[PDB]
Symmetry: C2
Subunit: 253 residues, 2 copies
């Protein structure tokens, strides 16, 4: 697994690769991946630094990991709006409690049904200020999701099932990062209608955050993880042995 | 001071009046008023009940009061959006920590520069859900502010100084409750441009919350407190001996 880390770092231009042994199910896998990320943050997140935090189960596992961490006054800033899916805001609050710092809420919903409503929220001074804080963070903590993980935008009524299938088929979206931006298998940003329905950071923000820590546990989602690595924004990849093997195979071939 | 409580209850149709002795300055007064409210909530807020929470220094003092309270699983729900002024969201988080429950964020800013932007946020499913939770709360914890306490809407650029003076002079606004609604000295809701710039609950919501706890410490703000009492929405008034004397004098005369 340490040999795997070196190959991943070399192959994908990472700062680090944190690889957990394969577990019996996805819950257990997320916990073990989250353990390595928790320790990484414990050692690296200094007082006065900030983390831009995305949403969902991979990220939530880091907040829920019950390991020992030193207390420091760090900030946890939502990188995506709230939901009425584990909310980035809730995760930041749990992280602040765990690591001994503070959290900073993005006062806007995660999803809207129209890019004009998106624009209206995004131009608002209160929303812009928090997004600027997240853009200026030293770290980002994000999950890599597959299209099926985003299906809640549809089930919540913000995007049609027809539009959703078309994002995949017409626009070639194979995954999301942090919940807030979407990519193709080749790592390019696809103009997709999807992102017009989300309030949060974008891919270019992640490209300029020094330490983007991205997390995925499921090897069946290796295409999404590959797409995400191809965007070039990831600095620390935390994942399982099988995912690592899959990525190296896909890259070699 | 106990005699004062009985007269206030009778005169203003309250459930309770919590009266603190006069203090040397407003900070100390807010602390002592907040002590009585903290104890009231300790005894009355049951597991599974909720509090709709407004913004500002009077309310924040209750969260910051360092008394002993029993832990119970109550909810603290923001009744007004966030600010980039002590935010209702921050207060709810501190209350949840203190009383041992949870908090529920309103994912929208407190202020907007245009009632059309207000309407767009207010119609959004995520915002409507939280506002419905706050409307259905057993308690509300709100401060009674004077126009000068709201001047931040102006300083933050959401409302012009000219509009602000006109809200007072043309529309007769003498105070706010919770940060989110405004009233005249006679207790009627004034159609004012001000409320078109705020996202949160309104006076009619407070009228149907069973236990509206309203807090003010400054006797120089007695006109605002009088206006607020005249709206009829207040169930528990927490304030100082001098404010109580002022209110009884104003009512008698």
């Amino acid at each position: 697994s340490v040999q795997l880390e070196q190959k991943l770092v070399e192959k994908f231009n990472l700062k680090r690769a944190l690889i957990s042994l394969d577990q019996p199910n996805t819950n257990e896998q997320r916990k073990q991946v989250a353990a390595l990320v928790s320790s990484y943050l414990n050692n690296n997140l200094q007082e006065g630094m900030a983390v831009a935090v995305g949403q969902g189960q991979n990220v939530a596992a880091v907040a829920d990991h019950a390991g020992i961490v030193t207390q420091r006054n760090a900030r946890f800033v939502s990188a995506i709006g709230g939901t009425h899916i584990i909310n980035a805001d809730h995760i930041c609050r749990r992280l602040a409690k765990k690591y001994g710092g503070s959290s900073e809420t993005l006062y806007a919903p995660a999803y809207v049904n129209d890019p004009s409503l998106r624009s209206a929220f995004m131009e608002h001074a209160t929303i812009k200020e928090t997004l600027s804080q997240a853009r200026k963070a030293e770290f980002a903590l994000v999950g890599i999701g597959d299209m099926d993980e985003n299906s809640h935008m549809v089930k919540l009524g913000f995007f049609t099932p027809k539009e959703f299938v078309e994002a995949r088929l017409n626009d070639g979206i194979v995954g999301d990062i942090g919940g807030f931006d979407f990519f193709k298998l080749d790592g390019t940003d696809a103009d997709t209608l999807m992102r017009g329905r989300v309030i949060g950071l974008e891919m270019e923000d992640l490209r300029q955050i020094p330490n983007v820590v991205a997390m995925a546990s499921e090897s069946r989602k290796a295409l999404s993880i590959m797409g995400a690595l191809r965007t070039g924004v990831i600095d620390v990849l935390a994942t399982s042995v099988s995912c690592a093997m899959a990525l190296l195979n896909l890259a070699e071939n």
